[PDB]
Design a protein around this ligand. Structure first.
Ligand SMILES: O=[N+]([O-])c1ccc(O[C@@H]2O[C@H](CO)[C@@H](O)[C@H](O)[C@H]2O)cc1
Length: 472
């Protein structure tokens, strides 16, 4: 039983628009911040790669559905490109080609018995909105509501699972370095917090919009996807345990405390540590923005489920490091990884499957056991179809999740493997492979070929159990 999926549990796979679509300027699509980064700053990206073509899923979406059907996916999580739909960012112009494209994908999925799950924002902000300052500018919350309205209006009759944002903890970091994630702005400890504040407001506006204008007719669910790693105490001391709690609150709690708790607002430790550090450095005002009481009440409770992106673990010890100012320095934890942990093709990604069970329990206890949908979990290598490391990664993480469900009572309701195909991997270009299907980026037809992990995942999805050969 601990190896069997609950009957209603949803299994599938996931992708993101800029990572797969290509067709970056085709049929009316406007430019986004990743078009800008890869065109203007190829020195930031491995091999100077771009997402101009990527997997060419704009043209090859029927092939993507074919492989999802082969895999036996029940749900396909994909994201919508904001600038493909609203090329100017604002809602004055709706690109019919964009509407037709996503309807064509949704309809193809449904005709093949696969449920669509749509992420509204996976990092590809229209450049016209970045030119106003992007996420640090609170005006983007209303622009995000207007974008969501166009999505609910056009697609909500058929789409019943929505995520507003994918991993703002990472995308806010685009405002904390001059050479990093788009838009590559160096405002650490200041602009990244402003970006977080806008995203939280935007998410809350989108959820209220669904309640007011769409839920009664459409009957779907709206969540948000938050990335978090497990943080294990470097030693068993109370002080190192405190540092791990700081990590959880500064990385997951930053977004989840305002939305998923009864109290709302940012975590106290976040408010308090940033206030103290700002005062010690001579600022008149805290670097952390504030919510009014009315805003706290508006934002809290804006969820039907919690999306979790989980990849790895860290060790945390008591102390402070990082540059002043920065979110890492403010967080009051020294983070490392254990050299014993198995490695991947990504410097930051170590294989620590027991950390997934620990994290699921931390979430259960902090947020009163919300329904959790694992929206990303996966592994990198440099290439190859006989992807034993990826197979092991998936089987171990699924086993740990199933223990969380069955033994620990955690309400996990679905899981989409990251990712369906090898991707444009952001600053890593085409150098790192996260797919369960390989794609030949040198072949204009971009054929998709199953790896061993795709065959194992199909076996899991078909049998609804972890096969005996992978059990302890
Ligand atoms: O803190 N971490 O461990 C972490 C943060 C952000 C992450 O981001 C993920 O990274 C994947 C692999 O590159 C991308 O394909 C995917 O688009 C992205 O959501 C993944 C992991």
């Amino acid at each position: 039983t601990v190896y069997t999926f609950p009957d209603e549990f949803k299994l599938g796979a996931a992708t993101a628009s800029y990572q797969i679509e290509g067709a970056w300027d085709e049929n009316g699509k406007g430019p986004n911040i990743w078009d800008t980064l890869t065109h203007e700053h190829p020195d930031y990206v491995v091999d100077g790669a771009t997402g101009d073509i990527a997997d060419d899923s704009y043209h090859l979406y029927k092939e993507d559905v074919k492989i999802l059907k082969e895999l036996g996916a029940q749900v396909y999580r994909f994201s919508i490109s904001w600038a493909r739909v609203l090329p100017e960012g604002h809602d004055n112009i709706v690109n019919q080609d964009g509407i037709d494209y996503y309807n064509n994908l949704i309809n193809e999925l449904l005709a093949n018995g696969i449920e669509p799950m749509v992420t509204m924002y996976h990092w590809d902000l229209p450049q016209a909105l970045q030119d106003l300052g992007g996420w640090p500018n609170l005006v983007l919350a209303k622009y995000s509501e207007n974008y969501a309205r166009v999505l609910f209006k056009n697609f909500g009759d058929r789409v019943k699972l929505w995520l507003t944002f994918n991993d703002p903890l990472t995308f806010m970091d685009g405002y904390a370095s001059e050479i990093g994630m788009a838009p590559s702005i160096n405002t650490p400890g200041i602009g990244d917090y402003l970006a977080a504040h806008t995203v939280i407001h935007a998410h809350a506006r989108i959820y209220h919009l669904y309640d007011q204008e769409f839920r009664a007719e459409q009957g779907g669910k709206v969540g948000i996807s938050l990335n978090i790693n497990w943080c294990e105490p470097a030693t068993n001391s109370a002080e190192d345990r405190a540092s791990c709690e700081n990590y959880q609150q500064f990385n997951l709690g930053l977004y989840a405390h305002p939305i998923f708790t009864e109290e709302g607002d940012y975590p106290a430790v976040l408010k308090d540590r940033v206030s103290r550090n700002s005062a010690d450095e001579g600022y008149t005002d805290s670097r952390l923005p504030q919510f009014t009481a009315e805003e706290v009440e508006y934002i809290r409770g804006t969820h039907d489920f919690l999306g979790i992106n989980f990849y790895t673990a860290l060790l945390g010890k008591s102390g402070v490091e990082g540059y002043e100012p920065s979110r890492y320095r403010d967080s009051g934890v020294i983070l490392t990884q254990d050299a014993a942990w198995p490695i991947s093709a990504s410097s930051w990604l170590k294989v620590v499957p027991w950390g997934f069970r620990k994290e699921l329990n931390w979430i259960k206890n902090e947020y009163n056991n919300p329904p959790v949908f694992i929206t990303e979990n996966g592994f990198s290598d440099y290439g190859g179809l006989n992807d034993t490391g990826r197979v092991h990664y998936y089987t171990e993480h699924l086993k740990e999740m199933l223990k969380a469900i069955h033994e620990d009572g955690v309400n996990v309701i679905g899981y989409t493997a990251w990712s369906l195909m090898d991707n444009f991997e952001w600053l890593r270009g085409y150098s790192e492979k996260f797919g369960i299907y390989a794609v030949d980026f040198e072949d204009p037809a971009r054929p998709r070929i199953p790896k061993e992990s795709a065959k194992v995942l199909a076996e899991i999805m078909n049998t609804r159990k972890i096969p005996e050969r992978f059990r302890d």
